[PDB]
Structure formats: structure tokens, C-alpha cells
Design a protein around this nucleic acid. Structure first.
Ligand SMILES: O=c1ccn([C@@H]2O[C@H](COP(=O)(O)OP(=O)(O)OP(=O)(O)O)[C@@H](O)[C@H]2O)c(=O)[nH]1
Ligand SMILES: O=c1ccn([C@@H]2O[C@H](COP(=O)(O)OP(=O)(O)OP(=O)(O)O)[C@@H](O)[C@H]2O)c(=O)[nH]1
Ligand SMILES: [Mn+2]
Ligand SMILES: [Mn+2]
Ligand SMILES: [Mn+2]
Ligand SMILES: [Mn+2]
Lengths: 286, 287
DNA sequence: GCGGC
DNA sequence: CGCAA
């Protein structure tokens, strides 16, 4: 399981001058905290081999040139069959870094070993994700107002909620399901939460997806629980002009009106101090 | 009903001549009927220039996961690892080669064969010898031909026919069909001996020995191209040089020309019309 | 040139 | 970024 880094000093984030070597070291540092939330899960990559300025691509299928030691499982979808890599070692993330795969994306479900035979099919969703996407001119004080409303709705079913800023524009809320439930079921539940909130605070929340997002409201993206969709993984970098991170936050932080996204270097600092704030999210692991 | 969509039609791949992807596509469409027989049943190695002859290139042997399911494919087992190659055997296969910016197509001297009992394909014997003539420092294309002629006779003196093909590069290729096919090992044995009998017959102009440098004033007869693991630029293939030259089959009379030169895709097209396939007898069979 | 349902 | 030996 050697991974040779190449183009160490190649700048991928021109704005901040972030070389592949930083990124390699970043993913080396976040490894212990990150791995648990992507283990057992099919890794979708979004790659910027030529920096965040040159075009990028999504990649699901594991290339034929990908190192044999990587874990892999197949998903069967209407037309075609996709074999994804499963990242579950620090070396796996090393590969991800070398690959210039800034972003790692996962669904909310894990592969499970077939009782009799052995090899893996997609299993039930282990967690819900609430994908909060702010509208035009949507105040931060209010984005959290909503996140808190979601938390209080879920705790009224004995479910805990963890906020993670996306590294992008909005906010993600994860909820562990002690007893896993199929993605359709996950979708059903998320959808009911969204709709119950939309009703409880009409002026700030919408459950309905719109081709151009709605001004002044927060859109609760419940269909992110569809077993066929992925959400940016916790502790992943983003391919934005600045190397921000999908970063877990404490609830206390959400009370900050001047709340903002975090950079890879800052997250690193926090981990040292904090540990994995999402520790109880995926307390079982491949 | 295998389709190939051309993308980036007007994208110039040879800046010097302004030859766009669409020219190349059309070329391969045009050379298809004559080219296909010499590469059918053979593992296609591609050398690709997706950004013109000025941007870097790569060899590709393995058939990518992303390539169209309708391509033919067989597998070769080697040292460590296994390689599934594409087999080009229809104009559409060539279409794919063009869309792929795979200027060059390289093949070995052998074909896959259907397994007598089971069906699927393992490497078979070599169907033809190839003599790869590599001229040295200050070697006049004239004397390069005398050597080519000397090879023809040594071979005719065993009832074997010889077809010349200019590589589209610097030197010259000779193919000989083997009526009865023979393992590449044996093909190498045969070629090595022709080369050596030649080296002796004309000491001043030929060498059989591979030098790291290329020896001035002499023509090196590359016999080891008959090795089963090696490939030679396929006849009718484009080259990825500053100019869009081609591995062109030439008639013997042409080799007598001292001002004998390489040919461009356009010329090969006008030749093929008037000529048919000069190599028609080289591979009389296969898809 | 291609890499996502 | 990787694509042959
Ligand atoms: O075009 C898309 C859009 C979305 N997605 C998947 O859906 C997830 C959520 O899609 P979002 O559009 O909400 O983006 P985001 O949450 O990552 O960041 P912000 O909205 O805060 O700006 C993304 O993280 C990605 O995994 C795609 O794969 N492709
Ligand atoms: O580095 C190499 C060299 C050669 N080869 C393969 O073996 C053959 C060796 O052939 P040559 O190296 O002699 O080049 P050529 O005959 O194509 O062109 P000239 O000599 O006329 O300039 C080539 O046609 C190619 O298929 C490689 O695959 N890689
Ligand atoms: Mn979002
Ligand atoms: Mn969304
Ligand atoms: Mn040569
Ligand atoms: Mn040679």
C-alpha cells in the first residue's frame, strides 16, 4: 500500500497557493477523524487535476489503472453497473490526494457483506442528512434559526443532530439512526421533517425544490436522502477558489451571526484541540 | 448498430498543416477498406495525441472501461499483469480510433485465434515477417533501397514474397506473408538469420546488431521486431510527426527512385483510389 | 479524450 | 491524473 506523491509543488488553489503536498498532508492529518464517516461507503470523487481554475469532472467508476489494493464494491443501476472505490485507510486518502480528488462525496448508506456468499451489496442508510441551502440574501442568523428548529424536531424522536458547514454556501445536518433504515424510508422521514418545519415557520423555510432557489427562504433539501445521491463528505476539501472544508461545528458556534466557512489549515487546528466532533455519528466501522 | 460521435471536428492536431480531427476522421473512413485486413484479429496499440502533435502523447494498450461495448477485445497474459486489447475490424472501429485522437495504430505480427473447443481468443502464431529497416547517420534513401532489394532476393530464394512500406517516418518496412504461419519465436529466428546472412553479403552497408547509438553509413536490419511482444506501426496508419505522414505501401519500382520520400495522408488517399490495396495479398483472410 | 445516473 | 512494455 505505497502511494507515491507526484507534482508535490503543483499549485491547485492559485488564490492561496496550495500545493498537492499541502493537500496530501491535510488528508494525512484528517485521516483518523474522517475515515469513519466514509468507510463502507462508495466514494464519488470530484477532481481538479489542473487546479481549481481548469475544468473538473465527477468520477464514480474506479479506473482500471487504480491500485489493486483499494476496496471496491459494485452498485447496479438501471443501465450499466458501477464499481466504486471504498476509502477506509489513510493510504486510501493518500490516493485521493495524489489523484487531485479535492472533493470526496458519499451517500448515506454502506455496503454490507452478504450473509451466505461474502461480497457486498448496497445496504440501509445509517444516517439522515438535512441539506440546508440558503436563498438570495438569506441571513446567517436565520440559517441557524432553522438548523435549531430541525434539531428540536428530531430530538422529539430521541434522535441527535450534528451540524457541519459545507465548505460552500450552506449547512448540513447529520443524524445517526441507531437502527438503520432503507434510503426510501430515510427520504420519507426527512421529507416529513422538512414539511413539518415549512409549516411551523412559513416565512423562512421551504420544502419544495425550485429551479431557481427562493429569495428570503431556506430550502430544506430532503431528497438528499435518496439512495442514489451523494453529499460532500465530512472533512472533505471543496474545489472553490479558497480551500474551504466541509467542517463539523459545535452547536454553540451556530449562534455566531458572523459564522463562516473554515479552511483546511483551520480545521487541522480544531481537530488537534477538538477530536472528532462527529465521533458518535458512525460509531461502528469498516 | 455501433455509432461514434465525432467531437471537436475543427480541432487542429497538426498545426504545421492545419489538419483537423475531421480530416483524420475522414482519412480513416477512406483508408478503411484497404487498412482493415492488416489489423483485423490483432491487438491494437494506440499512440494518442488528444491535443495535437505539440502536446505530449501516450501509448495505450489496455482498453479503457469507458470505451464502447461493441469493440472487439481479447486478453494477453504477460509477466505480471493481464491486458485486454481492442481489436479493430470495422470502419466504425477506425472511426473510434480517430475520435480518440489515436493518430498512430500499432500491431504485432500475430493474430488472436478462436479456441478449438471453447471459443474465446488466445494469441496465435505470427502470420507474417516484418523487416524494420532503420537507416543510420548520413544514409542515402537510395542505398536504403539496395538493402531492401537484397532482402527481397534472400526471401524469394525461399518462395517468399516481399512488400515494401515506407514507415511515414525515417526508414522503411518490409512485410512478407507466411503462407503457413509460425510462432513469433520462430519468426524471430528466421528474421535474425536473414539479417545475418545479409550483414555478411554486404559488409559495408548493413548491420544486424542493435547499437544504443545508430551506426553511421550503415542500415540496421531490426530483426527483433518479430518478437511476439513488440509492435510495428500498422500499414496505412498516420504518424504523429510535425507533418501528417503515413505508413504507406510502395511499389518496388518506386524504391528505385533516389528522391523517394515519405507520403502524406492526402497522397495516400489519391493513391488508394488509383491503386487498390497493394498489400492485398499480405493478409488474404481474417475479418 | 475520458472520467456521474 | 493516468493511459506500454
Ligand atoms: O450537481 C450536483 C449537485 C449536488 N451534488 C451533491 O449534492 C450535495 C449537496 O448539493 P448542494 O447543491 O446543496 O451543495 P453543497 O451542500 O455541497 O454546498 P452548498 O449547497 O452549501 O453550497 C453535494 O455535496 C454533492 O455531493 C452533486 O453530486 N452534483
Ligand atoms: O519506443 C518505441 C520504439 C518503437 N516502438 C514500436 O516498434 C517500431 C520500431 O520502429 P522504429 O523505432 O524503427 O521506428 P519506425 O520503423 O516506426 O519508424 P522509422 O524507424 O522509419 O523512423 C515502431 O513502429 C513502434 O511500433 C515502440 O512501441 N516504442
Ligand atoms: Mn447544500
Ligand atoms: Mn441542495
Ligand atoms: Mn524503423
Ligand atoms: Mn527499429
Amino acid at each position: 500500500q505505497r502511494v507515491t506523491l507526484t507534482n508535490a509543488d503543483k499549485v491547485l488553489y492559485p488564490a492561496t497557493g496550495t500545493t498537492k503536498s499541502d493537500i496530501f498532508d491535510y488528508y494525512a492529518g484528517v485521516a483518523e477523524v474522517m475515515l469513519g464517516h466514509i468507510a463502507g461507503r462508495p466514494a464519488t470523487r470530484k477532481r481538479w487535476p489542473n487546479g481549481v481554475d481548469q475544468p473538473a469532472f465527477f468520477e464514480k467508476q474506479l479506473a482500471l489503472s487504480a491500485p489493486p489494493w483499494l476496496s471496491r464494491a459494485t452498485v447496479a443501476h438501471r443501465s450499466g453497473t458501477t464499481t466504486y472505490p471504498i476509502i477506509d485507510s489513510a493510504t486510501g486518502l493518500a490516493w485521493i490526494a495524489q489523484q487531485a480528488a479535492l472533493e470526496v462525496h458519499v451517500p448515506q448508506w454502506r455496503f454490507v457483506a452478504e450473509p451466505g456468499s461474502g461480497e457486498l451489496n448496497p445496504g440501509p442508510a445509517t444516517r439522515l442528512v438535512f441539506d440546508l441551502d440558503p436563498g438570495e440574501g438569506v441571513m446567517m442568523a436565520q440559517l441557524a434559526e432553522v438548523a435549531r428548529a430541525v434539531r428540536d424536531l428530531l430530538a422529539d424522536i430521541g434522535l441527535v443532530t450534528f451540524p457541519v458547514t459545507s465548505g460552500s454556501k450552506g449547512l448540513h445536518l447529520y443524524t445517526p439512526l441507531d437502527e438503520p433504515v432503507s434510503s426510501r424510508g430515510a427520504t420519507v422521514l426527512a421529507k416529513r421533517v422538512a414539511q413539518r418545519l415549512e409549516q411551523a415557520m412559513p416565512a423562512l423555510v421551504t420544502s419544495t425544490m425550485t429551479k431557481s432557489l427562493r429569495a428570503g427562504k431556506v430550502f430544506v433539501d430532503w431528497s438528499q436522502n435518496s439512495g442514489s445521491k451523494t453529499t460532500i463528505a465530512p472533512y472533505s476539501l471543496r474545489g472553490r477558489t479558497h480551500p474551504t472544508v466541509a467542517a463539523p461545528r459545535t452547536w454553540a458556534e451556530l449562534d455566531d451571526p458572523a459564522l463562516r466557512q473554515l479552511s483546511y489549515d483551520e480545521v487541522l487546528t480544531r481537530i488537534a484541540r477538538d477530536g472528532d466532533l462527529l465521533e458518535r455519528l458512525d460509531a461502528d466501522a469498516p
